[PDB]
């Protein structure tokens, strides 16, 4: 029943958010399917190309 | 003090100086103390070059009401001989020599000397 944990790759880093700069909005493309690319916000040091793991796919999205 | 400082200021400029500044501060006029600053010309304040272009003297005038301080700063003119003042140029002054024509647009020849 539970959506399985997966792995997504950062195509571009949109910029900082959270009004303290702790979170960076990034554009993650799912490796399982290159077509599905969603925007997330991550905390910590980030750069293009690195792959982060996603406990669950779709939470929130917003343009800055 | 207004007239005396102006006369001092005019003497310094006439003698040849890039700038000057006199500040006579004390119990001028009434009991409340004020400072009068007469400044004209260039007058740097910061950096090392202050050490070799400006001359500062602080004097005390014991008038009846109290002590009336005097601060005089004179920026000396640059002089290659350096007797009248500093010999080093200001560090940020770049002076470019003027070239001649040096065109030579004519036919090439050989001068047998």
């Amino acid at each position: 029943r539970v959506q399985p944990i997966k792995l997504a790759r950062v195509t571009k880093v949109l910029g900082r958010t959270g009004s303290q700069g702790q979170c960076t909005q990034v554009r993650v493309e799912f490796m399982d399917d290159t077509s599905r690319s969603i925007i997330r916000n991550v905390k910590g040091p980030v750069r293009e190309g690195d792959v982060l793991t996603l406990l669950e796919s779709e939470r929130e999205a917003r343009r800055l | 003090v207004r007239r005396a400082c102006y006369g001092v200021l005019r003497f310094i400029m006439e003698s040849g100086a890039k700038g000057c500044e006199v500040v006579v501060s004390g119990k001028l006029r009434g009991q409340r103390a004020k400072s009068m600053k007469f400044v004209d010309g260039l007058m740097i304040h910061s950096g090392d070059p202050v050490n070799y272009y400006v001359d500062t003297a602080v004097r005390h005038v014991l008038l009846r009401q109290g002590v009336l301080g005097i601060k005089v700063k004179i920026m000396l003119p640059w002089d290659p001989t350096g007797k009248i003042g500093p010999k080093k140029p200001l560090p940020d002054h770049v002076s470019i020599v003027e070239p001649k024509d040096e065109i030579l647009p004519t036919t090439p020849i050989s001068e047998q000397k």
Partner: protein, 135 residues
Amino acid sequence: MGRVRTKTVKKAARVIIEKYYTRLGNDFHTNKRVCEEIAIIPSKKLRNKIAGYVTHLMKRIQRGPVRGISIKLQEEERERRDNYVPEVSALDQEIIEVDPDTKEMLKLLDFGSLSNLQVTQPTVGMNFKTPRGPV
């Protein structure tokens, strides 16, 4: 970040690229040595900065015309502005297209009925002007 060149380094650079364009080049080192006989620069960190921005202008002046002048560029500004006179003028059209009203006006001047003038069919619809407001 924080390597903007102050006025002095830029302002000195422009003077020595108009005084001495021919001697200078696109090498930081060759130019940094000319700046040692053409100018009395008090500081070493200043000439290398001056020499550095000179290359940026000398690299740029080889292509575009930077505001700093140059005789060889100015003579071509002259040659193109003052010459390339077309052998056939643009204002010698063999046939001059003419609105009916202009032909009427030229008729009043009594300079109408010239052969070079050719009347044109007047436009119809009076559809000039742009639709008012947005949309």
